[PDB]
Design a binder for this molecule. Structure first.
Ligand SMILES: Nc1nc2c(ncn2[C@@H]2O[C@H](COP(=O)(O)OP(=O)(O)NP(=O)(O)O)[C@@H](O)[C@H]2O)c(=O)[nH]1
Ligand SMILES: [Cl-]
Ligand SMILES: [Mg+2]
Ligand SMILES: [Zn+2]
Lengths: 995, 208, 16, 128
């Protein structure tokens, strides 16, 4: 029954409309949902705008009038210039009239702010179409009407605010460059008269609602108006004094002054400098006397969250940091300004204590600006001694966990600067802090962790002697703290912090072997501790110390009979006995870091052999009993043992890279045989159980083996220095092991990792195995494309790796695509375009890059048959497919690379890089240039794709576009202008002459 | 005690998936574009009693926009959503905020950067500063890993109730009833159980 | 000197 | 003299384990998550009856609340060695009693096997 309003053959029943609207906004459930579908259908009727004057006059429902204005908005922003001129004048007169009568009725003005604001916005859409060329008296009459009514005057401030926003803040995306400049110049041309009204209202009082609306509009003006309006009038005085006293105006005024601080100002005028000092001075004065003194506990105030206090303190932080980042030098030389300077910074100190992450980041950014300057700028740091001292405590006490990551690094940077500015004070604060952890007056898990991170973060700032004394005191004190606490929970926390600090001071460890050795032996002890987190902590600290101190493990230390790396390897079974597989791998990886420091090849290989002794023995055992009874591989235990062996090899190879080669050679051939055996079992399982088999633990275990084997090979080849060996020993066995298996498995059984592995092979040695690359394409190209060309969702990993593989092949071995049969090369082109249409960023970017690289590859071939045929077959396919994604509004993330590709394609023609004609000898006269034919093809293409464009628009667009095809920034601008114009009717073709 | 919440942001940013997580606990992998709006009641239990959000989950795609800013009327709070793996979705945050605060001039708003579970993050944390001058609360969230997924509603609850100390609490757990299933459905449930067993659980590589 | 004492001290750290 | 200025606490926790709970949508042939959090076996002191009570992290909302009936049976899922599937005839997590086909997955096969052990111990409690 509600669907009656959708019947336009009859009159519109306003009572029925209001019911549908009420049911949507105030109703619920199924009825609400139904009304929603009706209203949307109503609103999207292209004739609904005609029934808008009816609603705005005879409705008693504000939501209905709002919806009516939304219908008008669509019409004004998209189809305005198509209307008969009388409808345009009618719609305009109706909107103006409706706004006036709403403002005159105090009841409506008070209770319908939403409907009035919508009407104002609608008026502004008309202005963007009609003003000033067809409405030159708008501003003069606005200023006139303002004097006759406070309500109209206030509403005019809202209208101007929205106008300024639409013209200066939000025009870049929504209108053409020419249209935007036209409106900006028009506003700028009449702003003198606008400001006069604005300033008079501010100076003469008194309605705060009117004052606030005027200040709201001022905030928008400050984005673009010349500085003279602010500095050559008395308005700064009003902002920084009068309006900071009233809380109603205080919030908006503060935002205005923040923007004033960003105005474009001459830096050589002493009077202006005085004006900039003065408004700051006035503002801080008002805060101290009307809001809170500098001693106030802002942390507590913010936490209480009364009224608008949180927003105010946020806005005060923004004001103070913005002004001081730009102007604090104005306050630094004059002794009479010192108190002001330090009071402003003391407010920031207090603001910095607030528990609010995002606000802390804002203040922290400022502190960084400050202490960096004090670190470099002569004669400045003594000024801020007491500020910096307080800041040290604030940062130390709010240190976050290292490794969010971003905030810790920012804290570290500021605290390192503060430590350089005064090492003695930093040390004292930290030792003091540490004592209050020992006497328990500030003891907690959070407080000891925070202090430890802080102590760790300033590593490298002290002298080595001071650092030595410092590290000793801290570890001594922390060790005492650890013994003091009972229960594994407390001891775990302190022990972790102790290990964290030593790990942060490698310089200390490197200079004191006996101590480093003690630290490492202690970690080995902790690798037997079953308490949650300890083993992880022990392993992470181990590899972290090794990364920084590896040299001291590989050389023979004084008073030692051997390099400590030998000692670690001898006892490795015992050390790692209680660790989980992941943690063992980390341990072996850490050992690989050390072994790679040994540059005697014979010794390095011996160490490598000894390190891999346990996995190699386990390996040899399995390879023997694996090839004896392949049923073993169905034993989940054997599968897990095998995966972990391979993972151990990946871990060590990750550390050793090129050096890992002898170990790879130990297992390589049997490993690929294992790969084949596992592959058969997966196939057999899928045959006997169906696709569901791929979900079972057994098959997932088997596929893990294959994936880790591929990862190992990938990891080595990506780091290999001897590519002769890669090509002549590794590649052929690899390809024969993996390619046919991939091709001849059903889609759900194919490992995307194969593609990833092949991408690395082509990347490093592709140029040396052209036959190999062809073999790769044959085995994976068509069958993978068929997996991913039915939608954008299935096989997401195969999708991504596929285009990465094509990308590197197109870069390193383009010859391989030349060998493709014509039908297969056609699929290659189809695949690239298919990549364009993805929203998936991974796929889209590679799709566009391949297209670009492909065109360049074809170009480099010169005037030859394959290049000529390529352009005949695929040039306009690439042009039109690129245009499609450029203009369909669903691929905006790719705009830049689409533009680049398009520009490249067009430039080929206007440089005569395409020798043969792109047209049929029938469809165009003999001797016609490709340049002429290109313009024809494109004009026809755009005309059919965008039939609401005039021939003139299309012709002007293409004229501009092609002539700008050597200027990417300008070219891109013309495309953006085009994307605007296709959204509406009657766009100005002269817009394309902007550049 | 119910509050209207409007949820806005670019298409595909995870608005619907986010609300679904809160409504049923599920994670919806498929992208089915919201058409216009979907309204969903959402109740949280607090130490100040239950709080009800009427969540207006709006469409981010323009072709499915529906009533657009008409959905914002009389909203008492909002979440603006973007995708940290998609820069364009962050670039459009000022556009959503604009359309929103023009209708809702003074309401608590949370800005959410969704999908922080994804390794290849494109919108870096240090780039995200829009909320500062606009007094929006900001959270990194992930509907997939549930990272901070409760924070937006907790912050909003605190603003709307006026209690900075408001906390989510455990709803009362009544004693469940005893079982007496008739044998006349013994073959029926055994059918539905066989299908359930032979359909693999999703995300078997996850920690849980 | 006092570092050898620190090492000795570090060795005595244990959970139980 | 100066003047100065849940609903499960009548129960005992027999077992506790972290887990992820799924419900089967038979109309979509699709498993759907219902919640992640601590799964507890709660023994009522006044009836000695044992139930599963599970809550979501952070929101603490109940995603499972039902008696560990003696008639229920834990079955393995084809794709997992750390999960159990079983039919529940009356769960009251979301309002009225409703029947579900649940699956519950754990951190390890060990926690899963232990769960099954505890689950069956609790079943014979609800027999007595
Ligand atoms: N990795 C990851 N994916 C997510 C996350 N949140 C949502 N997604 C996925 O993003 C896609 C879009 O989700 P959706 O909720 O429909 O987005 P939307 O904002 O509601 N789109 P629309 O405005 O068109 O209705 C889905 O595939 C969803 O599974 C997340 O936190 N992490
Ligand atoms: Cl903080
Ligand atoms: Mg949606
Ligand atoms: Zn004004």
């Amino acid at each position: 029954s509600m669907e009656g309003i959708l019947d336009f053959s009859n009159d519109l029943d306003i009572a029925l409309l209001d019911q549908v609207v009420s049911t949507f906004y105030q109703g619920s459930g199924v009825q609400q949902k139904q009304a929603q579908e009706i209203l949307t259908k109503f609103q999207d009727n292209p004739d609904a705008w005609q029934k808008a004057d009816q609603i705005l006059q005879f409705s008693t429902n504000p939501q209905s009038k709002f919806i009516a204005l939304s219908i008008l908005d669509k019409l004004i922003t998209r189809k305005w210039k198509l209307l008969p001129n009388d409808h345009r004048i009618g719609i305009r007169n109706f909107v103006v009239g409706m706004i006036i009568s709403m403002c005159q009725d105090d009841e409506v003005f008070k209770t319908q702010k939403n409907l009035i604001n919508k009407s104002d916005l609608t008026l502004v859409q008309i202005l963007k179409q009609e003003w000033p060329q067809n409405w030159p008296e708008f501003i003069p009459e606005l200023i006139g009407s303002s004097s006759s009514s406070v309500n109209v005057c206030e509403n005019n401030m809202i209208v101007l605010k929205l106008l300024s926003e639409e013209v200066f803040d939000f025009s870049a995306e929504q209108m053409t460059q020419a249209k935007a400049l036209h409106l900006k110049n028009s506003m700028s041309k009449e702003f003198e008269q606008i400001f006069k009204l604005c300033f008079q209202v501010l100076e003469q009082g008194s309605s705060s609602s009117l004052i606030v609306a005027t200040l709201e509009s001022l905030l928008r003006y400050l984005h673009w108006i010349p500085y003279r309006y602010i500095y050559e009038t008395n308005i700064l005085e009003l902002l920084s004094t009068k309006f900071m006293t009233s809380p109603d105006t205080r919030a908006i005024t503060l935002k205005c002054l923040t923007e004033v601080s960003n105005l474009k100002i001459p830096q050589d005028n002493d009077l202006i400098k005085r004006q900039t000092v003065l408004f700051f001075q006035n503002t801080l004065q008002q805060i101290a006397t009307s809001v809170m003194p500098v001693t106030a506990d802002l942390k507590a105030t913010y936490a209480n969250a009364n009224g608008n206090d949180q927003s105010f303190l946020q806005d005060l932080a923004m004001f103070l940091t913005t002004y001081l980042a730009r102007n604090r030098a104005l306050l630094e030389s004059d002794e009479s300004l010192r108190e002001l300077l330090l009071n402003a910074h003391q407010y920031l100190i207090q603001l910095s204590k607030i528990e609010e992450r995002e606000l802390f980041k804002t203040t922290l950014d400022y502190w960084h600006n400050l202490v960096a300057d004090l670190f470099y700028e002569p004669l400045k740091k003594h000024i801020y001694e007491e500020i910096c001292s307080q800041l040290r405590l604030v940062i130390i006490e709010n240190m976050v966990r290292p490794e969010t990551i971003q905030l810790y690094k920012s804290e570290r940077e500021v605290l390192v600067y503060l430590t350089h500015l005064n090492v003695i004070d930093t040390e004292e604060i930290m030792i003091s802090k540490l004592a209050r952890q020992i006497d328990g007056s500030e003891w907690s898990w959070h407080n000891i962790n925070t202090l430890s991170w802080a102590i760790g973060s300033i590593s490298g700032t002290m002298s080595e002697d001071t650092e030595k004394r410092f590290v000793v005191t801290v570890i001594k004190d922390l060790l005492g703290l650890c013994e003091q606490k009972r229960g594994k929970d407390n001891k775990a926390v302190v022990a972790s912090d102790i290990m964290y600090v030593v790990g942060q001071y490698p310089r200390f460890l490197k200079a004191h072997w006996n101590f480093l050795r003690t630290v490492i032996l202690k970690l080995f002890e902790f690798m037997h501790e079953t308490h949650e987190g300890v083993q992880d902590m022990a392993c992470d600290t181990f590899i972290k110390i090794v990364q920084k101190c590896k040299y001291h493990f590989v050389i023979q230390q004084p008073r030692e009979s051997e390099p400590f790396i030998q000692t670690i390897i001898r006892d490795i079974q015992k050390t790692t006995a209680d660790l989980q597989p992941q943690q063992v791998h980390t341990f072996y990886k850490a050992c690989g870091i050390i072994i790679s420091e040994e540059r005697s090849v014979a010794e390095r290989n011996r160490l490598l052999s000894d390190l891999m002794q346990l996995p190699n023995m386990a390996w040899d055992t399995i390879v023997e009993q694996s090839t004896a009874n392949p049923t073993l591989l169905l034993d989940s235990e054997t599968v897990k043992i095998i995966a972990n062996i391979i993972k151990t090899n990946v871990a060590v190879c990750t550390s050793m890279g090129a050096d890992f080669y002898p170990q790879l050679g130990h297992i390589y051939y049997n490993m690929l045989q294992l790969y084949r055996a596992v592959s058969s079992m997966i196939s057999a399982q899928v045959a006997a159980e169906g696709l569901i088999a791929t979900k079972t633990p057994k098959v997932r275990g088997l596929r893990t083996i294959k994936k880790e084997i591929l990862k190992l090979v990938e990891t080595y080849i990506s780091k290999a220095r001897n590519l002769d060996d890669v090509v002549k020993v590794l590649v052929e066995p690899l390809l024969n092991a993996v390619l046919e298996d991939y091709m001849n498995n059903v889609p759900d059984a194919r490992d995307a990792e194969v593609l990833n592995c092949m991408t690395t092979v082509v990347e490093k040695v592709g140029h040396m195995i052209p036959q190999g690359v062809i073999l790769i394409l044959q085995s994976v190209f068509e069958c993978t494309l068929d997996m991913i060309n039915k939608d954008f969702t299935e096989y997401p990993e195969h999708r991504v790796e596929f285009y990465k593989l094509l990308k590197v092949i197109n870069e390193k071995s383009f010859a391989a695509f030349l060998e493709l049969p014509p039908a297969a090369f056609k699929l290659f082109v189809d695949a690239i375009c298919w990549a364009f249409k993805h929203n998936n960023r991974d796929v889209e970017v590679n799709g566009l890059q391949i297209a670009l690289d492909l065109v360049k590859n074809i170009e480099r071939m010169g005037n030859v048959p394959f290049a000529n045929e390529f352009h005949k077959n695929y040039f306009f396919i690439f042009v039109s497919e690129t245009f499609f994604v450029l203009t369909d509004s669903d691929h905006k993330s790719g705009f830049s690379k689409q533009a680049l590709l398009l520009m490249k394609l067009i430039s080929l023609v206007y440089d005569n890089k395409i020798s043969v004609p792109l047209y049929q000898e029938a469809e165009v006269p003999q001797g016609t240039s490709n340049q002429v034919y290109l313009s024809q093809y494109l004009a026809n293409m755009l005309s059919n794709a965008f039939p609401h464009l005039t021939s003139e628009q299309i012709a002007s667009f293409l004229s501009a576009l092609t002539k700008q095809c050597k200027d990417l920034v300008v070219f891109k601008g013309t495309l953006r202008d085009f994307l605007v114009q296709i959204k509406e009717v009657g766009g100005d073709p002269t817009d394309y002459l902007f550049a | 005690v119910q509050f209207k919440l409007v949820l806005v942001g670019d298409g595909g940013t995870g608005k619907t998936t986010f609300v679904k997580r809160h409504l049923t606990g599920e994670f919806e992998k498929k992208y089915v574009a919201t058409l216009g709006v979907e309204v969903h009641p959402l109740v949280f239990h607090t130490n100040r009693g239950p709080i009800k959000f009427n969540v207006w989950d709006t469409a981010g795609q323009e072709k499915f926009g529906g009533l657009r800013d008409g959905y914002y009327i009389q909203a008492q709070c909002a979440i603006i959503m973007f995708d940290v793996t998609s820069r364009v979705t962050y670039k459009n945050v000022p556009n959503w905020h604009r359309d929103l605060v023009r209708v809702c001039e003074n309401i608590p708003i949370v800005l959410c950067g969704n999908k922080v579970d994804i390794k290849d993050r494109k919108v870096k944390a240090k780039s995200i500063v829009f909320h500062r001058k606009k007094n929006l609360q900001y959270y990194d969230i992930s509907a997939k890993s549930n990272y901070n997924f409760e924070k937006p509603f907790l912050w909003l609850a605190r603003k709307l109730i006026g209690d900075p100390n408001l906390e989510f609490v455990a709803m009362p757990a009544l004693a469940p009833p005893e079982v007496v299933m008739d044998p006349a459905l013994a073959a029926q449930y055994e059918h539905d159980l066989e299908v359930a067993q032979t359909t693999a659980l999703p995300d078997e590589d996850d920690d849980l | 000197g006092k570092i050898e004492e620190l090492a000795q001290n570090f060795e005595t750290m244990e959970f139980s | 003299h100066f003047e100065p200025v849940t609903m499960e606490e009548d129960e005992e926790v027999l077992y506790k384990v972290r887990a992820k709970l799924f419900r089967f949508d038979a109309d979509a042939k699709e498993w759907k998550e219902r919640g992640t959090g601590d799964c507890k076996f709660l023994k009522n002191k006044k009836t000695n009856k044992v139930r599963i009570l599970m809550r979501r992290d952070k929101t603490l909302k109940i995603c499972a609340n039902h008696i560990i009936a003696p008639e229920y049976t834990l079955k393995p899922n084809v794709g997992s060695d750390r999960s159990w599937v079983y039919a529940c005839t009356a769960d009251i997590a979301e309002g009225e009693a409703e029947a579900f086909t649940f699956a519950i997955r754990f951190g390890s096969k060990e926690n899963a096997d232990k769960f099954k052990e505890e689950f069956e111990k609790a079943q014979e409690i609800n027999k007595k």
